[PDB]
Design a protein around this nucleic acid. Structure first.
Lengths: 260, 66, 61, 67, 67, 62, 68, 67, 67, 68, 69, 66, 261
RNA sequence: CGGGCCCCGAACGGCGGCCCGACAAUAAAAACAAAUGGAGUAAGAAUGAUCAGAA
């Protein structure tokens, strides 16, 4: 087995009050990649967030409310690294990576880009910087699993009424083109769309009860994995959890097992 | 003989340098431009000078009509 | 092999081709050869013979 | 040469309902109308031309005896 | 050329050894080879489905047979 | 072709080789015999495979 | 083989012994350098030799720009 | 000699500023500084591997620290 | 002097299976047999001498605490 | 010893010339020389990066400098 | 300068005529028997007398284990 | 030093074009301006200092005698 | 804009060209670098501040004897590094090569021996050609891109020379010269800027002394801008102004969109 | 030992001469965390002024 959980909690505190800690504790998994901690590493040090039988790793942004990402693993990773050299990355700890034998996973959290124009500019900046870094991450032997919420949909199949969202951030032409270039040209794939080419599957919908009723979801979570692991995809699922997190948990299993 | 229709189409795409998107049998989309071709090979110029074997090319979709 | 596809092309029958990867292609037959089939649908979406699995015309011929 | 052609000719003459499965595993159905060295015509509601290089196996719905 | 697969398959057929042909798609095909020729082998399944070589990948006999 | 030197060298030295198929499943075992169409692995079951669905043959030891 | 554009490419990849990244159809990647080639096989020298088949190679992406 | 390296490394270790070492081979490292001495240094990370000084190329702290 | 000798002595005493990576990138394995101011003997199946000027870093397989 | 190193290095430091340091493997660094000693050099660049002497290959300044 | 392990180890490998396999820092495998060694050079006896330098050697891998004094 | 110092001094005297090769395998053209126990000055457009431990060989462009 | 202008001028003696006003014309003619060839003057002669143009950095490697050969090179901004060696007796002893270094580009002034003088000159030309194609085979390994300002004294194709049926005897269009040049432009991958921009005839770069050939335009395209296949796509425009000619050769100006640094 | 080269038979075989198997040398890459699941997955053109299809 080889499970991976992705829950952009948008605040580990709200996650705790919503019962995310108990759900993850009950949810038997190998690695858990929650995003947007909205708290300092010292806050994550609170044993309440420490899941029984899992390690604690977290990198906080310069400003807690800005972001922050954490990573829980069942076995001691070979090494944990944070940052990518970019200001938009280092100054906010939006990237944290653990190292295991043969495969090393990472936790990515892109800026929403929907708050303001400056957020969209930062999004474009981080996108170009990240595709550059990944170009530098081509011939690298170690296979990767960039588990992160990219705040962008690849195809219309990933979001309904695209006609209305075409101009709204998250589905704009340049972001979709960047994602397509990152996926196809560079040989990267996705476990879900590979194992299950089924529409209507989303992760992030408005907290508004109306959108939840009519299910206005935007697929923002993606299990970006190097082509080496593409062959070892078991199955993907997007549970419709009752408002536990804006980004619904993204659980995927893999045929390839892990090792220290 | 074998490429009476493939050869002229590929040669026109090359001369016109139309940005094409090659879809592999594996389903991986490959955007870029056709640099050169032959019997069973096509050179795609992009960020990385790529060589895609014809036997593994499913479809090619030029972005503009030719 | 040749006569069937030639009739499909000349008669302008709406053809839908399922590739070996399963992709359901749609379009009309523009021109074909030993190892190539030009599919006319907005753009000249060329399709190779080795990757074609089934050719589904909309009506018999 | 010695086995494929007689088997397919018998399937055609007897018009046995055969079930063909593609290399990918997709299950097809229909009768063998005409054979070819590179292709086959499977008439099932709408005649579909299937390529031989994409045929995994040919499952006849009824047992057949070679000549 | 083609001097090795012929005797191997002929011996597998003569002794009627249960072979498990694993297709390229990862599907099992337990049965006995009834015959074989170019671009074709004939299984001894309840229906005796005719398989194509291009699709076949491996031919493992359940019991190790001698050459 | 360089395929036959490689294969017969592995056969003479009987090096445990790991063969990857087109699907990707990892096979293991020595090579007993081979021709242009098939390979006869020396595995516990000696699973025979045709040459039209091979990916890469690599020896576990240099 | 009539035009043989693959032959000059493989020859320049081998003569300079450039690090190649031969992708396969299954999805795995094979790092190394082309030692030699023929019609259906290519030799990758990564500690040990790899008998990667031609018909299984999806794309060949050299990590080193090769002028030609 | 070695009058500047000592205070720099001592401050980096005391403040435990996470540093990223880069080996001469081009390999990168991460983690705080555990200890240091002549021809040897100890890295404070998930694993406390011992790195020799003659193989280190640069010492880049995550956040610029003051000497 | 102050940190290298105790660390190496503890590694040797505890006989922890360590995997040393050379500056050239080669991966080695084995137990620590003995060390010197210029050389270290690593025993894996057969004793393999390694020089101190050719090691990138020493990675103990188990966490160790200095004396 | 080092009768020629210290003058050149301290002159570069005084003039604060943006120098480009080439390492043994080939990668090039950039930044003004902040401070140095017998074995290490500090770059005033945003990263405040320190580089060891035994790993540095060449120190090429962006502009010609006068010898004191 | 006054070591303890290098000299006896190399002397034993020389006397016992053990087929030694030396690893260079470049990653090339040298094969041969030890002829004689010095503070800075090791003579590898393999048909030709190759004078391999000490600082260029990475590891000395003998073909068979040897007892230590 | 025994011989390296006389050789470098002779090269500096006539300002003969030399080619310094680093360990990585690259060659640097120019002429020696000065040298010491650890560094060599190779003047060419800009005064670039090179370290001894990183140099592999000094090849004069033309025949020169001690 | 990101324009890069390169001016290659074979003067056959900088003295005559300067007398005709090449120095002032170049000083006024904006350009990043000037690939002036065939100086026929020593480095000490080029050291004369009269030839030194303001706002540029002069670099030249003369031959053992000035009039025999000599090549120079100008540069507005200080190049990264300049090298004046090739490794051949036909090259080093004659200062026929001088290469500068830039950001991912290498401007190189090249001057092959004419060969039209005497049979010994033809033998020297063949020797230099084989040595230079060997050097090019060795250089193709290098990743960094290169530029070669070179008057090769060899006609490439029919369009690159008038009345080739008659010129098939004159050095420049000979069979071995044609083979060598097309191999340089062929298997070796190197390309030309003029032939890339304008596949139009009547474009020559050398004429005899007799004004008859000039009026009839019986000239050869002995000047080339051999480009590494990389910048081939980055060739903007090219021209061969025949009227403002200051020697047997004509100024060859090529502007690119690539920006050096 | 086995790869690259030329040599020779009748797009197709193969044999001798050899060389190398550590690149007579990247003006330099803000950095390579270290080199068989298996009896088979295919939801709807905002509308041809009008389509008979054979031994």
């Amino acid at each position: 087995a080889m499970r991976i959980i992705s829950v952009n909690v948008n605040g580990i505190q709200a996650a705790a009050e919503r019962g995310l800690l108990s759900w993850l504790q009950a949810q038997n998994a190998d690695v858990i990649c929650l995003q947007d901690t909205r708290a300092s590493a010292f806050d994550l040090d609170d044993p309440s967030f420490q899941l029984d039988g899992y390690f604690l790793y977290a990198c906080d942004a310069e400003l807690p409310e800005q972001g922050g990402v954490a990573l829980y693993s069942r076995l001691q990773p070979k090494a944990v690294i944070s940052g990518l050299g970019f200001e938009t990355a280092d100054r906010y700890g939006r990237y944290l990576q653990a190292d295991f034998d043969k495969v090393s996973i990472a936790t990515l959290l892109l800026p929403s880009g929907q708050s303001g124009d400056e957020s969209l500019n930062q999004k474009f900046k981080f996108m170009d910087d990240f595709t550059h870094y990944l170009s530098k991450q081509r011939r690298k032997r170690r296979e990767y699993i960039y588990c992160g919420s990219l705040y962008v949909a690849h195809q219309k199949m990933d979001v309904k009424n695209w006609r209305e969202c075409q101009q709204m951030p998250g589905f704009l032409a340049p972001e979709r083109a960047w994602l397509d270039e990152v996926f196809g040209n560079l040989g990267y794939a996705d476990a879900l769309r590979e194992v299950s080419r089924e529409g209507d599957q989303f992760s992030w919908w408005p907290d508004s009860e109306q959108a939840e009723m009519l299910n206005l979801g935007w697929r923002f979570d993606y299990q970006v994995l190097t082509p080496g692991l593409r062959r070892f995809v078991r199955n993907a699922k997007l549970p419709r959890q009752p408002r536990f997190s804006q980004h619904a948990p993204l659980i995927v299993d893999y045929d390839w097992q892990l090792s220290i | 003989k074998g490429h009476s229709l493939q050869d002229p189409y590929l040669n026109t795409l090359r001369k016109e340098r139309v940005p094409v998107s090659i879809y592999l049998v594996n389903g991986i989309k490959l955007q870029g431009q056709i640099e050169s071709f032959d019997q069973f090979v096509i050179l795609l110029k992009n960020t990385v000078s790529q060589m895609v074997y014809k036997h593994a090319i499913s479809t090619v979709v030029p972005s503009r009509p030719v």
